[PDB]
Amino acid sequence: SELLVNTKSGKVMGTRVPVLSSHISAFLGIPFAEPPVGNMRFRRPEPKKPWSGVWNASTYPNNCQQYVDEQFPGFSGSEMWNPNREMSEDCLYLNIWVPSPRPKSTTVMVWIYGGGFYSGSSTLDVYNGKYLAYTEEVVLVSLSYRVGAFGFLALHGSQEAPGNVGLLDQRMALQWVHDNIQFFGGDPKTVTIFGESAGGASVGMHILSPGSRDLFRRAILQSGSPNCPWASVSVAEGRRRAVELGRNLNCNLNSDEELIHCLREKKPQELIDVEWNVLPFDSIFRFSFVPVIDGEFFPTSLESMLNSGNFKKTQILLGVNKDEGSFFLLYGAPGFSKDSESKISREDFMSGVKLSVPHANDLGLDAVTLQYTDWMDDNNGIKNRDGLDDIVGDHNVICPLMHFVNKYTKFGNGTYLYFFNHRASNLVWPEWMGVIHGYEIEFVFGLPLVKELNYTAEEEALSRRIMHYWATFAKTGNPNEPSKWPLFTTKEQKFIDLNTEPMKVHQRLRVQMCVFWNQFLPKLLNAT
Amino acid sequence: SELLVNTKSGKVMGTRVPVLSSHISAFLGIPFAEPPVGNMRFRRPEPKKPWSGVWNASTYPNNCQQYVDEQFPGFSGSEMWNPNREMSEDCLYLNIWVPSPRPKSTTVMVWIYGGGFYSGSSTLDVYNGKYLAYTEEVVLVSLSYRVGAFGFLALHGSQEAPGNVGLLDQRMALQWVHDNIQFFGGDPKTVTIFGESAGGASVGMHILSPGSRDLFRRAILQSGSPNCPWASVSVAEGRRRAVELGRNLNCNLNSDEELIHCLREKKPQELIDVEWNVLPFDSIFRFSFVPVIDGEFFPTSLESMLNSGNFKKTQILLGVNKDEGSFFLLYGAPGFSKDSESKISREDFMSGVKLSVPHANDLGLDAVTLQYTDWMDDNNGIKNRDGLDDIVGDHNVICPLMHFVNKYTKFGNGTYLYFFNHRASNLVWPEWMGVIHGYEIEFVFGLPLVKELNYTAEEEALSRRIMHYWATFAKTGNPNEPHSQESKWPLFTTKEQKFIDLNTEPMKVHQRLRVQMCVFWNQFLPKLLNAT
Numbered sequence A: 001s002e003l004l005v006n007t008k009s010g011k012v013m014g015t016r017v018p019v020l021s022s023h024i025s026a027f028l029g030i031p032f033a034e035p036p037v038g039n040m041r042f043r044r045p046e047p048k049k050p051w052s053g054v055w056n057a058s059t060y061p062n063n064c065q066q067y068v069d070e071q072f073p074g075f076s077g078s079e080m081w082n083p084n085r086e087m088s089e090d091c092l093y094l095n096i097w098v099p100s101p102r103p104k105s106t107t108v109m110v111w112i113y114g115g116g117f118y119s120g121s122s123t124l125d126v127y128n129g130k131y132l133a134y135t136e137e138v139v140l141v142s143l144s145y146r147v148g149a150f151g152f153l154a155l156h157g158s159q160e161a162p163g164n165v166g167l168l169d170q171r172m173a174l175q176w177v178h179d180n181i182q183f184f185g186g187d188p189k190t191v192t193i194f195g196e197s198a199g200g201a202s203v204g205m206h207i208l209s210p211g212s213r214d215l216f217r218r219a220i221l222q223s224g225s226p227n228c229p230w231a232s233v234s235v236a237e238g239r240r241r242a243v244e245l246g247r248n249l250n251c252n253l254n255s256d257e258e259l260i261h262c263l264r265e266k267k268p269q270e271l272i273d274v275e276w277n278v279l280p281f282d283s284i285f286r287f288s289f290v291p292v293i294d295g296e297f298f299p300t301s302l303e304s305m306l307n308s309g310n311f312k313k314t315q316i317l318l319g320v321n322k323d324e325g326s327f328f329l330l331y332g333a334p335g336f337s338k339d340s341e342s343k344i345s346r347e348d349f350m351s352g353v354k355l356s357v358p359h360a361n362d363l364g365l366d367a368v369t370l371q372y373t374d375w376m377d378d379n380n381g382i383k384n385r386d387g388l389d390d391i392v393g394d395h396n397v398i399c400p401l402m403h404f405v406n407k408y409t410k411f412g413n414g415t416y417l418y419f420f421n422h423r424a425s426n427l428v429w430p431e432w433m434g435v436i437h438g439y440e441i442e443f444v445f446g447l448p449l450v451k452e453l454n455y456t457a458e459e460e461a462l463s464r465r466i467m468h469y470w471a472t473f474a475k476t477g478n479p480n481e482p483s484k485w486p487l488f489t490t491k492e493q494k495f496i497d498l499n500t501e502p503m504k505v506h507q508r509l510r511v512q513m514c515v516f517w518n519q520f521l522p523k524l525l526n527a528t
Numbered sequence B: 001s002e003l004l005v006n007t008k009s010g011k012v013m014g015t016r017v018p019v020l021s022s023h024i025s026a027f028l029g030i031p032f033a034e035p036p037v038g039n040m041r042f043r044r045p046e047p048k049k050p051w052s053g054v055w056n057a058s059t060y061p062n063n064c065q066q067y068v069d070e071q072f073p074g075f076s077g078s079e080m081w082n083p084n085r086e087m088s089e090d091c092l093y094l095n096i097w098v099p100s101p102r103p104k105s106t107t108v109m110v111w112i113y114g115g116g117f118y119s120g121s122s123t124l125d126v127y128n129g130k131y132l133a134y135t136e137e138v139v140l141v142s143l144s145y146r147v148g149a150f151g152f153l154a155l156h157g158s159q160e161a162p163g164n165v166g167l168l169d170q171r172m173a174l175q176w177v178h179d180n181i182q183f184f185g186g187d188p189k190t191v192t193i194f195g196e197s198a199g200g201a202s203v204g205m206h207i208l209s210p211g212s213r214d215l216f217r218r219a220i221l222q223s224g225s226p227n228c229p230w231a232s233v234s235v236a237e238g239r240r241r242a243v244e245l246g247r248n249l250n251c252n253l254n255s256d257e258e259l260i261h262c263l264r265e266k267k268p269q270e271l272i273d274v275e276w277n278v279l280p281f282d283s284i285f286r287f288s289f290v291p292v293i294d295g296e297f298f299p300t301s302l303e304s305m306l307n308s309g310n311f312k313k314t315q316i317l318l319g320v321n322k323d324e325g326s327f328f329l330l331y332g333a334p335g336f337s338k339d340s341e342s343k344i345s346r347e348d349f350m351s352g353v354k355l356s357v358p359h360a361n362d363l364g365l366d367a368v369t370l371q372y373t374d375w376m377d378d379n380n381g382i383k384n385r386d387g388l389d390d391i392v393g394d395h396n397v398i399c400p401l402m403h404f405v406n407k408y409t410k411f412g413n414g415t416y417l418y419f420f421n422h423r424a425s426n427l428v429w430p431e432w433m434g435v436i437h438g439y440e441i442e443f444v445f446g447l448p449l450v451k452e453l454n455y456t457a458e459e460e461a462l463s464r465r466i467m468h469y470w471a472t473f474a475k476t477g478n479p480n481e482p483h484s485q486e487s488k489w490p491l492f493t494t495k496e497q498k499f500i501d502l503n504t505e506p507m508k509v510h511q512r513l514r515v516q517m518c519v520f521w522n523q524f525l526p527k528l529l530n531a532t
């Protein structure tokens, strides 16, 4: 049947789904690994053992155990990111949307959710893959992976909790696509992995990791890169946090086995409740359990790998949004509120930069401050707000990504950069937040194409050209079909704006600030 | 007889000089100290001892021994600053212009020339005081002082070459004005001291030094302040340079006595020839022999003195010109030329910053570079040229002056700040140099009032209001004339920090003169350089 597919691990029965007055095939909750429960917690994923009979792939799977945001109960702005189904450690599944009739050897796109490595689900409404698969006629896959301690507790040396298992889960899902996508009409030789935030950082890390390189063809990174300051920690820092987690839960800390056995006896919510207690400083845009530079998944430091060109050489398409920092300021910085313009006093501004650059010394903080303060009008609350907004976005997303784009381009086979700066007309967040981190996703997934969501006609057209840029890129390595999106080159360094107005080409995206963040500040903190 | 005056040191005979269809009395070349020659070299000045008969004061005196600029032979733009009289170690004299008929007890203004403490003359044509004294009816005095090694060689400890003697020469001329100016019609209780560049730093130094404070009423500083990076050195650096001068002349360096004795046997031109070799690094806007923080003329560090209010509290009027650094870039920075647009390559831009901030470590250099570089267009020759111009101007003159003004105002009794940004219609220097360091002086001294000089009608008016501002300030401590119709020059307050532009257009009030860059130079950079 069109809905009955035999994979290498067993049979799966999909379901016919409606989409824009038509239909496509959907296979939800297909297991790609053995449930990482009990003694398998913190351990590398194990391939899913074959099963007899037909697997019911008609409904979404459980979401992985994670911290749940309850800042604004009932508010769709924050809740659209929360797990929309039962949470469970048995959460390693993937979803597939296939156009009907089933194509032959068509392009495949694999989505990797973000969420700072401490959260995220493959089942969110905004990640619904039916519109993109249909409109662009590609086989769209969305995977899952352990987040939080469950996926990144790192005790280098141990094989029970080596760290990076969340990334290894992602790899096993890609390995599964490599071996079974052909049975759903997909071409395993033309797979594009794409993700946002932590998902973008993940895509980037797979580009770097030798063990992942052969599992995909091209990549798309949205508002995230492997070198982001929050995306990874050293084995030493990973160990300290892991040990501090045990301490918080009164664990025997005599050895790794004792520490691990203790942590494995605790219930999921017990770990999550103290998850944030292991951070070394008071800060924002910083997460407890993230990937570790182990010398295994990551041969050597990310920078040395980027300078030597030790990574997959292919085509990449990446970009950022206009206001990457607002979301995190709102949750952890004084003076910010969801129900006000949020004019930031000078005192709160100071507090904010400290929170934004926890690792910096006083001289470093003075540098950031001077770099972002207009001394002809320092008591302007709006400028202090926008300034803090830029500080968080530039340091955590934009500049780290530009550093990545410039390094990759020297060895890559084609780079396409974008600057998404369109403010959705039906946004539920306040205006001061601007073009928020993660809100280009709804456009990438074609949400504007559904009338009921009340988007403007201009936004629908915008979403359509964005999906076509992504799809066309996925299948050829060029977002343009034979206004052309120019190729980012080391010399001209061009990029385009992504909004409802006719395309505009620019050069050197926020080069001034990024010179500060990528060269001066690092040098300053190293010398002092 | 207007021209015949008897001072505490003897009689003097002035001369009647014409001025704008009228006339005034001029007393030129009056001695105020003993010739600091022979064994006097490097030593503190000594009061001129009484003389008999009438001293002929109808001609300008000699200029002090100094380096002479021969970069552009025949070029007026540079030569107008060179000595226009014979040089000699016997140069401690002063000139005086007195309105005619002789006033009874009027306002006095004393001019202190600049020149980096290594040059300068009281006799230059641009300092001719007849126009100002005549138009504003004030008694105008022009003093002189030893420059270069002769006036600032410092070997702390010794009493033969203690340092700051050039500053002491200035003080002695002030002591003379205090004791004798009343005989020329001026009020010794109402003396304003004003100077440009090094002259400006000097005025600021007298405001600070306890030994100078009671010798004047108010002060005007033009493009210069005591805290400028080039205006002084530590006793240690002073000794280093002093010893380095001897080494450059095969002098016996076994002791101060022998070192000094050796340097005193040398001809003037001999010291001058190697003057520049004693500098720490290759640089621009840096001079070999300047005032030293000795603990005597200067009780403690200039900064601690400014923070504690340890200085004369009165009214001050100061400011800067739009393009303070162009003059120095032209002379010592690669890529600059008098006969070209001077578009600076990135390579030369880098070299210039190294030159402009010679005391900075690699980190400090990157900081400066980043602060003045538009990374969206880094190869723009013009932006690179102007960027260097701003770097040199902000670091050496503007920001140090803003630091001074903000600290002084916390204790002062009245601050007036200006921003001179008028490019004279008859400038001989190239367009890229803009409003040059020192070119506000011609307006201050009324040169625009003489037709043959070809200044525009609007420049004459500008000169007249500037002279009136200076004089009125000298007389009352406020450049504004009460209940007058003209726009008012507002006071500079720690809170509003107001200042006016000084040009041919109607007055404009602004606030926080170059705060952005000055916060960088006065707060951030020092912290960075202090780190390690």
Ligand SMILES: *[C@@H]1O[C@H](CO)[C@@H](O)[C@H](O)[C@H]1NC(C)=O
Pocket: A056, A057, A058, A059
């Ligand atoms: C698969 O599961 C869905 C939801 O639980 C159920 O409606 C459906 O009948 C199941 N498949 C069959 C027909 O066995």
Ligand SMILES: *[C@@H]1O[C@H](CO)[C@@H](O)[C@H](O)[C@H]1NC(C)=O
Pocket: A412, A413, A414
């Ligand atoms: C990609 O590689 C091919 C051959 O390997 C080369 O012909 C092409 O120019 C490259 N494209 C870019 C823009 O690097």
Ligand SMILES: *[C@@H]1O[C@H](CO)[C@@H](O)[C@H](O)[C@H]1NC(C)=O
Pocket: B056, B057, B058, B059
């Ligand atoms: C003073 O010097 C001037 C200039 O040389 C001269 O004209 C005048 O006669 C001199 N006075 C006397 C009598 O010495």
Ligand SMILES: *[C@@H]1O[C@H](CO)[C@@H](O)[C@H](O)[C@H]1NC(C)=O
Pocket: B412, B413, B414
């Ligand atoms: C200057 O001092 C006098 C006398 O104490 C005082 O009345 C006046 O307000 C002061 N003016 C300023 C501007 O400080």
Ligand SMILES: *[C@](C)(O)CCC[N+](C)(C)C
Pocket: A081, A114, A115, A116, A117, A196, A197, A198, A199, A437, A438
């Ligand atoms: C990124 C750090 O992974 C943050 C992603 C945040 N959401 C809210 C868009 C999921």
Ligand SMILES: *[C@](C)(O)CCC[N+](C)(C)C
Pocket: B081, B114, B115, B116, B117, B196, B197, B198, B199, B437, B438
């Ligand atoms: C100041 C450093 O003393 C420079 C004065 C230079 N002139 C050319 C205006 C005399």
Ligand SMILES: CC(=O)CCC[N+](C)(C)C
Pocket: A069, A276, A327, A328, A331
């Ligand atoms: C955007 C987020 O929900 C940040 C996480 C908030 N806590 C630190 C309070 C858990």
Ligand SMILES: CC(=O)CCC[N+](C)(C)C
Pocket: B069, B276, B285, B328, B331
């Ligand atoms: C500011 C000056 O004109 C510098 C004097 C010239 N040398 C350094 C070459 C002697």
Ligand SMILES: [Cl-]
Pocket: A018, A019, A020, A450
């Ligand atoms: Cl629908």
Ligand SMILES: [Cl-]
Pocket: A083, A084, A085, A086
């Ligand atoms: Cl639920």
Ligand SMILES: [Cl-]
Pocket: A409, A488, A489, A490, A491
């Ligand atoms: Cl290239």
Ligand SMILES: [Cl-]
Pocket: B402, B403, B406, B515, B518, B519, B522
């Ligand atoms: Cl300042």
